[PDB]
Design a protein around this nucleic acid. Structure first.
Ligand SMILES: [Mg+2]
Ligand SMILES: [Mg+2]
Ligand SMILES: [Zn+2]
Length: 461
RNA sequence: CCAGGUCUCUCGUCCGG
RNA sequence: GCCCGGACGAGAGAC
């Protein structure tokens, strides 16, 4: 994905849009109790901890476009993935304006607590003003759509989130693209019934984990995979995608019944953004923040992966591929072992930078013991070996607990980390409750007992 | 006084059948 | 006791 230009937006009659200049993350009651190497992310160029040109670091990810042409391997990939989806019987009609705004089975309402994007952002206009959950009124949304139409530009923001040291020093903050409310509504009428089907069908048919619950889904996964695993992450996913893959997606969409709205994918593939004072244009790259981000990412991942198998392993039977993706994050399997270092190598050709799922340096043989998906390991219970624990490392839970965006949230936050930690077992969960209680405010919280969590888990089956 | 997207899951608070 | 739904908030995870 590549940047086509940049100019003060004044010079094209777009407003200047300046976001906050401070992190909302303050150190936690438990800041010294537990340890961590993570600090809040760079939000502005004038950030002391910076050891590089910020704005060159944030846009650094647009590494350009390798391919533009759907080659023969991508086509068979497209052919195979789409045939898979065909079995889901995905209703291919537009979704009515009411359900696109307000939600329906498989599709949540629009988040009323996030902004309406351009132009509303610059008019001091909010989704709340426009949307009414109680009435489900589409009248005013229709007016605005009539008035401002679609394909509006996306307002760029740096995510306020925790970040490692190298990433605070190399100014590697993550960038989100504020989709316009008009385009979310438009995107969801076109595609609501597709999003819905994906949400309802986590697993190896969709090749997507969107809609899953790790506490319950970890027990499904090993039974769904083939005998040997391989797994991946990608460096800069959204921004590493060339238009070739977007065409491939368009072709998939056409094949399953969405031919008429495949043009929405071009607005994704060639997009315009507003960032502080500038205004820029990108070709290729996923505008992370647009409706469908997760679905389209995960769908493309399924294409990418089929492609490389076809190109690296002649006579590979894709009907024995079993893979689950969450955006770039993927765990995959095949009846016989495959070499992720080779697949990755071929990957390099289509513009992809592929890694082990943990962003380790070198690929290892992937086993039910080392594999990770969404950061969690897999660990059979000791009493019931068919039930599998999603095991998130305490290291991650330690990082989280050390900060707060608001201290009035400590009960919920810390309680929520308990529902992740106890999968590390009683001995480690109980040591956790120790440290939390090693200070006054901890002893204020209502934390659940290992046995309560264990009984809920088992009962939940 | 507020600025920061698209989502999934879970927890919590409150209100319903 | 067991469901089912609603509104708000929070954490985690993907981008
Ligand atoms: Mg990535
Ligand atoms: Mg990932
Ligand atoms: Zn242009």
């Amino acid at each position: 994905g590549e940047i086509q230009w940049m100019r003060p937006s004044k010079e094209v009659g777009y407003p200047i849009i300046n976001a906050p200049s401070k992190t909302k993350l303050e150190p936690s009651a438990f800041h010294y109790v537990f340890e961590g190497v993570k600090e809040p992310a760079v939000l502005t160029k004038n950030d002391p901890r910076l050891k590089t040109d910020f704005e060159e670091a944030i846009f650094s990810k647009y590494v350009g476009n390798k391919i533009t042409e759907v080659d023969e391997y991508m086509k068979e990939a497209v052919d195979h993935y789409a045939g898979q989806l065909m079995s889901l019987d995905i209703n291919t009609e537009q979704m009515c304006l009411e359900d696109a705004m307000y939600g329906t089975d498989g599709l949540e309402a629009l988040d009323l607590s996030t902004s309406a994007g351009y132009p509303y952002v610059a008019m001091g206009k909010k989704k709340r003003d426009i949307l009414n959950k109680q009435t489900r009124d589409t009248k005013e949304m229709q007016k605005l759509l009539d008035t401002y139409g679609i394909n509006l530009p996306l307002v760029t923001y740096v995510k306020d989130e925790l970040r490692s040291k190298t990433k605070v020093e190399q100014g590697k903050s993550r960038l989100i693209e504020a989709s316009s409310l008009n385009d979310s509504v438009a995107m969801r009428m076109a595609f609501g019934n597709l999003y819905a089907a994906f949400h309802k069908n986590p697993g190896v048919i969709t090749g997507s984990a969107v809609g899953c619950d790790p506490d319950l889904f970890w027990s499904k996964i090993p039974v769904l995979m083939e005998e040997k695993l391989f797994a991946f992450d990608y460096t800069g996913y959204d921004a590493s995608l060339s238009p070739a893959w977007f065409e491939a997606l368009k072709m998939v969409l056409e094949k399953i019944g969405f031919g008429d709205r495949v043009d929405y994918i071009d607005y994704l593939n060639h997009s315009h953004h507003l960032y502080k004072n500038k205004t820029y244009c990108v070709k290729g790259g996923m505008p992370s923040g647009c409706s469908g981000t997760s679905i389209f990412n995960s769908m493309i991942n399924n294409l990418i992966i089929r492609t490389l198998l076809l190109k690296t392993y002649k006579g590979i039977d894709l009907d024995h591929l079993k893979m689950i993706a969450y955006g770039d994050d993927v765990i995959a399997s095949y009846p016989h072992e495959v070499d992720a270092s080779l697949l990755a190598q071929s990957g390099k050709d289509y513009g992809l930078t592929m890694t082990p799922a943990d962003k380790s340096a070198t690929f290892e043989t992937v086993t039910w013991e080392n594999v990770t998906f969404l950061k969690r390991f897999f660990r059979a219970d000791e009493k019931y070996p068919f039930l599998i624990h999603p095991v998130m490392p305490m290291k991650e839970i330690h990082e989280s607990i050390r900060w707060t965006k608001d201290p009035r949230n400590t009960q919920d936050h810390v309680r929520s980390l308990c529902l992740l930690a106890w999968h590390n077992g009683e001995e480690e969960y109980n040591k956790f409750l120790a440290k939390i209680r090693s200070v006054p405010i901890g002893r204020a919280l209502d934390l659940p007992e290992y046995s309560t969590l264990y009984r809920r888990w088992l009962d939940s089956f």
